[PDB]
């Protein structure tokens, strides 16, 4: 994964 991608549930 990319660090700055959506870190939350249900992206």
């Amino acid at each position, epitope marked *: 994964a990319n*660090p700055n991608a*959506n870190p*939350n*549930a249900n992206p």
Partner: antibody
Amino acid sequence: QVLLVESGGGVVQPGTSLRLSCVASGFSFSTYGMHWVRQSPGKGLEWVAIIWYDGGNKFYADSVQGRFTVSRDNSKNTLYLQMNSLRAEDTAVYYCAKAYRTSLDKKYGMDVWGQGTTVTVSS
Amino acid sequence: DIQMTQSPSTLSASVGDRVTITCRASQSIASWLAWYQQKPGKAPKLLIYKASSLESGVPSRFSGSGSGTEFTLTISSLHPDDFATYFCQQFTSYWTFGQGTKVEIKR
């Protein structure tokens, strides 16, 4: 009423281990990524770590990678920062922060921070 | 992994003045820029997100502009509540901050 309360800071001797805690209220903690950011008088604001909503993906700043560890207990609404091999440069106020809301955006920052916990590494 | 620098590092201004803080990225960050306000002994508070979007409850006298490598934070008319330190943060390549701009009262 999104709220984050840090705890566990204090005075420790160099080379020891300290675990910081961050407690969340006012939002579904299990559903959000979480951050640790620290601030010294002489290093400004410095990002430390991020952990995915489910505790899987974890990323670290190079200044702490290998020594610090981020984790979380979603059943306790608590974020953790485990600090090992502390050195004088790790003296700072440590803030926990909540990831920004899910949207169509590809890049994500933070929106709400806690009040901070002070770590002092001292001989 | 992108260096943000702010200018000036200290700004002295009067109540009612229009003030402008600039932030420069070492490389293009598109519009992935955030503006924070921090008062002494307090946590940073998010004012502007993705370059220009005012957060809920932040007064409209605050506005952010820019894209790429050059960004600006403007206060149309300074209130005593606005005297604080302001940080810019890029959030496209990890998360890095400028060194801060302390807006102090002129006398």
